[PDB]
Amino acid sequence: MKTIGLLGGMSWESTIPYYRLINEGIKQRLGGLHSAQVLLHSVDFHEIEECQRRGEWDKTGDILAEAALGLQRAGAEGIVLCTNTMHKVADAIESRCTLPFLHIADATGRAITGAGMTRVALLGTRYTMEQDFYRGRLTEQFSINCLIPEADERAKINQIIFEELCLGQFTEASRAYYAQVIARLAEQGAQGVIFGCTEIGLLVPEERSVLPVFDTAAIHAEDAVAFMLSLE
Amino acid sequence: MKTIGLLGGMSWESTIPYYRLINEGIKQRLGGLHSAQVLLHSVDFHEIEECQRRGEWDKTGDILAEAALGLQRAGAEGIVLCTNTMHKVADAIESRCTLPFLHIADATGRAITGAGMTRVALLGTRYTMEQDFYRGRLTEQFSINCLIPEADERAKINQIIFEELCLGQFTEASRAYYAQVIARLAEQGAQGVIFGCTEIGLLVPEERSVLPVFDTAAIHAEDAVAFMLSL
Numbered sequence: 001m002k003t004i005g006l007l008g009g010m011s012w013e014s015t016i017p018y019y020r021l022i023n024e025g026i027k028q029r030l031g032g033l034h035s036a037q038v039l040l041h042s043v044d045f046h047e048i049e050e051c052q053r054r055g056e057w058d059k060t061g062d063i064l065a066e067a068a069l070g071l072q073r074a075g076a077e078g079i080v081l082c083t084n085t086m087h088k089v090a091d092a093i094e095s096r097c098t099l100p101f102l103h104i105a106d107a108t109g110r111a112i113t114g115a116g117m118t119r120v121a122l123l124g125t126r127y128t129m130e131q132d133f134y135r136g137r138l139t140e141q142f143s144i145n146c147l148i149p150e151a152d153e154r155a156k157i158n159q160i161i162f163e164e165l166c167l168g169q170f171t172e173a174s175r176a177y178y179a180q181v182i183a184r185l186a187e188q189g190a191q192g193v194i195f196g197c198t199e200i201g202l203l204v205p206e207e208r209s210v211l212p213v214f215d216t217a218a219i220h221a222e223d224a225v226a227f228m229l230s231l232e
Numbered sequence: 233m234k235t236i237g238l239l240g241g242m243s244w245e246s247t248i249p250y251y252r253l254i255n256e257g258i259k260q261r262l263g264g265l266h267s268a269q270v271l272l273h274s275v276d277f278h279e280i281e282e283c284q285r286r287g288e289w290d291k292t293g294d295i296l297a298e299a300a301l302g303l304q305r306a307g308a309e310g311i312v313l314c315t316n317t318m319h320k321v322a323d324a325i326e327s328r329c330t331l332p333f334l335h336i337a338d339a340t341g342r343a344i345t346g347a348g349m350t351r352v353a354l355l356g357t358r359y360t361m362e363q364d365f366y367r368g369r370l371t372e373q374f375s376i377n378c379l380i381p382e383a384d385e386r387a388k389i390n391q392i393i394f395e396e397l398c399l400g401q402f403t404e405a406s407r408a409y410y411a412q413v414i415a416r417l418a419e420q421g422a423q424g425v426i427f428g429c430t431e432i433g434l435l436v437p438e439e440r441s442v443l444p445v446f447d448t449a450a451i452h453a454e455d456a457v458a459f460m461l462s463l
């Protein structure tokens with residue numbers, strides 16, 4: 001199998017499902033006590049998230065490109081970035097590191113494509129929902145259109161991610177609020193919902209979503225597994 | 233903070249508690265969204281575990297020393313090996329890698345020392361329970377003596393580790409069996425119980441142990457946090 005290189009810590013809470021599912025994927029395919037060959041660089045999320053709010057995206061591109069290059073030298077054979085928001089600077093990583101870069105939005109777009117859907121709801125950080133870097137790739141490469149919540153809903157969705165989810169707090173109040181937003185986008189004709197923040201899956205089980213769930217972290221991890229074994 | 237280097241995936245299920253507890257310790261200490269600087273090398277445990285059964289210990293020493301050296305060169309400032317059994321080959325890592333090596337038995341010995349205890353039960357793989365490499369360090373460095381289960385109990389304890397715990401299977405029958413062994417070693421005057429396999433705490437909650445619990449993984453993670461920020 002190939003050694004996968006993970007850029008994690010963003011937050012570390014959502015790096016864990018990546019680690020778990022990549023190992024469970026290898027066990028499923030290889031059987032026995034086999035586990036995945038993983039190199040993980042977990043960053044201090046404080047610096048990353050600070051740059052997000054300052055708009056210092058070039059600085060985060062440096063941080064992540066350096067991290068990927070260090071994993072390359074350690075033997076990583078592909079790069080997985082464990083965060084939807086930071087694919088805003090995926091170009092920097094793909095440009096400065098020659099390793100194959102498994103873009104989260106490609107794995108998500110193939111999953112939605114496989115379910116035959118072109119109009120889906122999108123939850124994530126305010127950056128991922130409101131800007132073009134994520135939604136524009138889904139549109140240009142898969143002809144997939146995203147519906148996002150209203151402004152007041154986006155601010156609270158974003159607040160929960162950073163003030164609760166990334167600190168390990170999963171409240172039923174926030175869980176029920178996310179379910180409520182999903183249900184409103186369902187009435188706009190959304191066919192599925194992207195959990196487009198890697199932590200949302202930690203808060204919202206699939207039976208709380210009135211609509212079929214695309215969990216970016218699960219989907220990304222399965223794409224990692226398929227790369228490590230040269231499958232799918 | 234110093235970036236920590238983890239040698240994990242032995243098994244990956246016990247690597248997760250390390251990653252969680254190290255991050256939580258950094259958060260508690262720096263506050264806010266601060267997270268731990270971590271480089272993890274997770275190996276394929278199949279090759280390691282087969283080597284244990286074949287007695288190919290030198291081969292695992294090479295694997296782990298090479299892994300440690302790769303992490304050092306990626307920026308690792310200290311090494312944490314996320315497994316009790318493989319400290320049998322800690323000498324290979326410490327001899328070939330100049331980084332500070334945070335020995336799991338030293339972290340556990342200071343915890344038992346802090347509790348004022350000198351006679352404890354030891355649960356773990358058959359290798360950790362029966363051989364000298366782990367218990368001999370506790371004896372030499374801390375004057376701590378370990379009591380271990382009888383032979384039939386050791387075989388089933390080890391059995392559960394590799395056929396259930398390392399596969400993510402946590403059964404009540406196994407949990408109850410471990411609980412009965414702990415209650416049995418308590419009869420021999422064990423003052424506490426070392427969970428000397430990093431997966432045992434995933435199975436046995438502290439409230440199922442009639443003895444005070446030294447969870448090796450938790451203690452090791454707390455020591456790593458203390459190192460990373462020089463406490």
Ligand SMILES: N[C@@H](CC(=O)O)C(=O)O
Nearest residue numbers: 010011083084085197198
């Ligand atoms: N990890 C979350 C939050 C973040 O990275 O800002 C995401 O996928 O967007």
Ligand SMILES: N[C@@H](CC(=O)O)C(=O)O
Nearest residue numbers: 242243315316317429430
């Ligand atoms: N992780 C277990 C099993 C092993 O690595 O052999 C231990 O601490 O000993």
